[PDB]
Design a protein around this ligand. Structure first.
Ligand SMILES: CCCCCCCCCC(=O)OC[C@H]1O[C@@](CO)(O[C@H]2O[C@@H](OC)[C@@H](O)[C@H](O)[C@@H]2O)[C@@H](O)[C@@H]1O
Ligand SMILES: O=C(O)CCC(=O)C(=O)O
Length: 309
């Protein structure tokens, strides 16, 4: 009954395909203006949850994590009813935003590798989210918002429909780090990579390949968002550099509050080091009940409440 709830037909399509949308959070004009201001603000990490990131060596997107914990706009964004009423339709009455991540594609950048994520296992094989072990559910609902236009030419997302119910990768396997890939590694005809790593190295079967012939593009205008299971096969196109503007996506990740977030961990464990979770918490964006085993925050590190404005 909530204003932006998924219709029954949208809920059915989400169940079949593993994604639904795009939907509008902002007009393109509002998004363009907001991102202009926000991009400049984010250069200042003085209030960021994670400090001393220079101690983490090798490949890591950690600098793009969890800026909602310090930023005024992002703190509202993760709580937008346009997003949350739809996540509620899938995840129920009590839901946490446990992770956010920026995905820049600069002109010429490689496409994101085909991947699925279920446990979000850390460097030591330890899951960062755990669902009830007596049940068959896994992963997180990803809401990917286009902070810029997202088109094939600048590296929009792509999905293989209906692949969210079986994992092709083992997140406890180890990838090797390539500092000098130069966005140049061609994988079945497409430049792809994973932050210096190769997600193919996580495959359960080394000889298996994604059903890329069945991939579908997801072009989006600035201010739109797409909702998908992290367990769905997903990737992005390369940025051809035809446009000299970078593409920016912002992912917010949601789990029901009964899911254990960073269980038995006081750090994000990357290949190159540990990042303290001292100033981390999950944000309760829907409902008001969460079990005590999940650490919550109610405000950013600059005292801005997590609520939609
Ligand atoms: C009071 C209301 C509380 C509601 C809590 C939210 C429940 C959502 C569960 C879900 O759909 O999870 C789907 C995830 O689990 C996966 C893992 O493969 O699916 C499993 O769940 C089942 O959904 C009932 C099956 O359809 C699939 O075969 C699948 O294995 C993927 O579809 C997703 O990652
Ligand atoms: O923006 C991208 O290129 C990848 C996004 C993604 O993999 C995700 O949010 O799950």
């Amino acid at each position: 009954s909530k204003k932006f709830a998924l219709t029954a037909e949208q809920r059915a399509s989400f169940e079949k395909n593993g994604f639904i949308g795009p939907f509008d959070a902002y007009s393109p004009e509002e998004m363009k203006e907001t991102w202009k201001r926000t991009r400049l603000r984010l250069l200042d990490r003085s209030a960021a949850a994670y400090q001393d990131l220079d101690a983490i060596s090798g490949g890591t997107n950690i600098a793009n994590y969890d800026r909602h914990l310090d930023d005024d706009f992002l703190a509202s964004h993760i709580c937008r009813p346009e997003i949350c009423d739809r996540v509620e339709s899938i995840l129920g009455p009590n839901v946490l935003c446990w992770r956010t991540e920026f995905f820049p594609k600069y002109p010429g950048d490689e496409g994101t590798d085909w991947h699925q994520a279920d446990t979000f296992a850390n460097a030591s094989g330890k899951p960062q989210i755990i669902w009830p072990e007596n049940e068959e559910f896994g992963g997180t609902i990803t809401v990917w918002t286009a902070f810029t236009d997202a088109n094939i030419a600048n590296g929009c997302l792509q999905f293989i429909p209906g692949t969210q119910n079986s994992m092709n990768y083992d997140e406890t396997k180890r990838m090797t780090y390539e500092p000098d890939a130069n966005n140049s590694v061609v994988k079945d005809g497409v430049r792809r990579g994973f932050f210096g790593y190769d997600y193919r190295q996580l495959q359960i079967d080394e000889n298996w390949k994604p059903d890329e012939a069945s991939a579908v593009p997801m072009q989006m205008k600035a201010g739109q968002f797409i909702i998908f299971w992290s367990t769905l096969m997903h990737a992005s196109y390369p940025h051809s550099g035809e446009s000299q503007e970078m593409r920016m996506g912002f992912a917010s990740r949601y789990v029901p509050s009964f899911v254990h977030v960073y269980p038995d961990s006081d750090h994000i464990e990357e290949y190159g080091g540990r990042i303290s979770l001292e100033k981390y918490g999950a944000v309760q964006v829907i409902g008001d009940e969460t079990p005590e085993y999940n650490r919550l925050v109610t405000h950013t590190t600059r005292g801005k409440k997590f609520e939609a404005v």
